[PDB]
Design a binder for this molecule. Sequence first.
Ligand SMILES: Nc1nc2sc(CNC3CCN(C[C@](O)(Cn4cncn4)c4ccc(F)cc4F)CC3)cc2n(-c2ccc3c(c2)N(c2ccccc2)CCO3)c1=O
Ligand SMILES: [Cl-]
Ligand SMILES: [Cl-]
Ligand SMILES: [Cl-]
Ligand SMILES: [Cl-]
Ligand SMILES: [Cl-]
Length: 211
Amino acid sequence: EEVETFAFQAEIAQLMSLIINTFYSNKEIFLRELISNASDALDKIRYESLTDPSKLDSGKELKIDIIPNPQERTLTLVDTGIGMTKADLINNLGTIAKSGTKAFMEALQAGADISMIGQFGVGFYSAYLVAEKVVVITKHNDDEQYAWESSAGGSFTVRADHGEPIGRGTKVILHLKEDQTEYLEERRVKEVVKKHSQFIGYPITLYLEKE
Ligand SMILES: Nc1nc2sc(CNC3CCN(C[C@](O)(Cn4cncn4)c4ccc(F)cc4F)CC3)cc2n(-c2ccc3c(c2)N(c2ccccc2)CCO3)c1=O
Ligand SMILES: [Cl-]
Ligand SMILES: [Cl-]
Ligand SMILES: [Cl-]
Ligand SMILES: [Cl-]
Ligand SMILES: [Cl-]
């Protein structure tokens, strides 16, 4: 459909540049942060479903799938959580991330570690430790399916997605940088998940490569 391009908030662009440009070997933290976000989104639909059960008509299973695709050089995290509205994508989430971003940057200047990004609520952006491009497909009840995409550089796009319906939730598609293909391997993904994400209350299925 028609693609709309937007500038990130100045503070968010700056955090993204920092994540992309800083020498920082502990890149695997991205996966814990994205799992955390997926888990939060599942909590939200589960909670809402307690006062409006019809919110689960778009899909009853609450789960997280992690899917490596070597041929495409993608690692995808799929959740069946609440999903994001257009307003979330374009404005609202970035608006709330502003204050967390500022505090995190301040902590970094005062000697904090990039692994504390989650404690500031802006862990999503750690995706850029490993991805050159992130595509996000998302569907909230009573809104339509959207595709968001950013290769950083200060901007992102949003468009109506006409791909396969996901029913409800979010797919985070990480287009990995060339030297980060370890996150496509079985043992590596399992090792990182076990390490950092032991106590998440929804089933996480780590899919295997077919070839
Ligand atoms: N798989 C996921 N599914 C879901 S569904 C949902 C809506 N539901 C909302 C999410 C917001 N919640 C509030 C809060 O959690 C509060 N808070 C503030 N400070 C610490 N906590 C929050 C967290 C981060 C933030 F920027 C703004 C916030 F208001 C309440 C329910 C959000 C969401 N995301 C997600 C999570 C964090 C993100 C982003 C996405 N982004 C993002 C990512 C791609 C494109 C555009 C934008 C960039 C900011 O960060 C997931 O990744
Ligand atoms: Cl923004
Ligand atoms: Cl609510
Ligand atoms: Cl909206
Ligand atoms: Cl809903
Ligand atoms: Cl498996």
